[PDB]
C-alpha cells in the first residue's frame, strides 16, 4: 500500500512517551498479599529446625496419586447413604434382629486429629497420611515422631484440602487406614513399602538436618559473584 508508512517510534530516554508495559513486578499489592508472600520468604530465609522442614519433603506425584487412588476406595459414607442405611437398620430392628448388625461392617478412612493420634497410640493404624500445610504446625509436627515410635508407616502428603475432599470435609489435616479389604491388602503392603522408603527409613537422618538458610535471587547472585573472586 502506497498510503501506509513506517512510523517507528523511538522509545529511548528523552523521546516518545513510553508504551504501556507489564508492571506486574512493581505492583503495590494490598497488605494481606504482601504479608502472605513475605511470611513464606521469612520462613525460608531463617534456619528451619529439623522438626519443621521434615515437612516440605512430601510424597512425590506418582506415589501420592496411587495412594489417593487406594484411599478413595474407603470413603466414609455421606449423609445421603447414612440416611438410607439407618432406614435399613430400622427395618432390620423391626423384623430381622440377627443381633443388631444386619448392616455389614464398614471399611472407611479414619480422620480427625485426636482420633488418629489415639489409633496410632493403640497401634491400630496401618497407614497414616499427614497434611504438609497445617497452620499452626504444632498440631501435626509431633506426628512423624509418634508414628516412628509406634512403628506405624506415615507419609507427609501435599494438601489438607485434598485430605478433606477425601473424607468429605473442607480440610482434614490427617487421614489413616486401619483396615482394608482382602483384595486391597497387597496394594496396601506395596504402598507401605514405598512410603517407608521415603519417610520412616530416612527419619533419623532427616531429624538431624536443618532447613532454610536460603537466600533471595539478588543476594544469591551477589554471593556467587563474590565467591567467583574470593
Amino acid at each position: 500500500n502506497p498510503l501506509t508508512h513506517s512510523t517507528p517510534k523511538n522509545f529511548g530516554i528523552g523521546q516518545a512517551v513510553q508504551p504501556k508495559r507489564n508492571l506486574s513486578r512493581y505492583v503495590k499489592w494490598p497488605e494481606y498479599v504482601r504479608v502472605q508472600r513475605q511470611k513464606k520468604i521469612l520462613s525460608i530465609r531463617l534456619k528451619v529446625p529439623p522438626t519443621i522442614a521434615q515437612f516440605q519433603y512430601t510424597l512425590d506425584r506418582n506415589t501420592a496419586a496411587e495412594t489417593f487412588k487406594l484411599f478413595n476406595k474407603y470413603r466414609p459414607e455421606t449423609a445421603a447413604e447414612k440416611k438410607e442405611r439407618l432406614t435399613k437398620e430400622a427395618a432390620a430392628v423391626a423384623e430381622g434382629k440377627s443381633k443388631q448388625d444386619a448392616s455389614p461392617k464398614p471399611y472407611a478412612v479414619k480422620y480427625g486429629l485426636n482420633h488418629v493420634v489415639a489409633l496410632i497410640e493403640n497401634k491400630k493404624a496401618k497407614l497414616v497420611l499427614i497434611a504438609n500445610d497445617v497452620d499452626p504446625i504444632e498440631l501435626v509436627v509431633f506426628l512423624p515422631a509418634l508414628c516412628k515410635k509406634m512403628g506405624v508407616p506415615y507419609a507427609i502428603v501435599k494438601g489438607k484440602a485434598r485430605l478433606g475432599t477425601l473424607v468429605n470435609q473442607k480440610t482434614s489435616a490427617v487421614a489413616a487406614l486401619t483396615e482394608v479389604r482382602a483384595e486391597d491388602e497387597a496394594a496396601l503392603a506395596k504402598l507401605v513399602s514405598t512410603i517407608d522408603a521415603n519417610f520412616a527409613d530416612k527419619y533419623d537422618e532427616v531429624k538431624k538436618h536443618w532447613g532454610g538458610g536460603i537466600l533471595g535471587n539478588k543476594a544469591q547472585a551477589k554471593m556467587d559473584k563474590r565467591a567467583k573472586n574470593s
Binding site: 529511548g12 530516554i13 528523552g14 512517551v17 513510553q18
Partner: protein, 247 residues
Amino acid sequence: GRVIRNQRKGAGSIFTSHTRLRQGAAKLRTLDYAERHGYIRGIVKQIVHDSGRGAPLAKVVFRDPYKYRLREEIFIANEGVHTGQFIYAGKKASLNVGNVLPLGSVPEGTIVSNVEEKPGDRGALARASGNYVIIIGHNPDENKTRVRLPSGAKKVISSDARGVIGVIAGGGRVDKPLLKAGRAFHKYRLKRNSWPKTRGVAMNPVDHPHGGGNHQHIGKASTISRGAVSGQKAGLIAARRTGLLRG
C-alpha cells in the same frame, strides 16, 4: 519561674514560618530511570522571586516520560541561568551551568549547588544565595566523593547524589547594611516571628536566666554545657572558646 522565649518557640504557635507567598518547596526532580541512566532536557520558563528566600527560583518544565503531560519543577536558580535555557539532568548530562549531574560524573574542582546528602533526597546542601559545594575528590572503590561545604566542613557523599553545576544566584546580598529597623522588619515578616529581640539581661529573673540584678549583667558564666536542660540553654552553648578571634 516562667517558661522562657526559646522554650516557647518549640510549641510553634506564633513562631511558625510565614509561607503564604512562597512558590513551593525548591527541590530537584524525583530521581527516576531517565536521570539514572541517561539525561532528560527541561526548559527554563521563569526566574521568579521567592518570599523569604534570598536566592531566586528557576521554574523548569520537563516532559513526563510515562504519560503525555508536562511536569513543573522548582529549582533554585544558579548564576547565569536564563529563561528559555535548556537544562540537562541525568548521569550523561553535560558539564554546564544549570545542569544536574551525579557527583561521580564531575571532575575534582567542580563547583556545584543544591547538592543531595543522599541520592534521591532532591537537594540539601549549598542552597542559600551565593553558596556552593566544591568537589574535591573521588573514591570509586567505595562509590564515594569528598566535598567541601559552605561552612568549610569536609564531607563524604554517595557518588550517586546529584548536584547542579554552578553557584546559587543572589550572592553578595548580605554585603549591604540594612541601615534601619524597618528593613529588618520587612525581612522577617516574610520569614517568621523572631524579630525584634529582647536581651535576657533586660528582663526580670522570672523571664530569663540573665534577668534581674541591680545592674544589667549576666552574673554567671554564659558558656552553657551540652548537658544543660531546656530553660538553661541561654547564652553560648557548648562554646569551645569565646572572645574575639586573634586578639
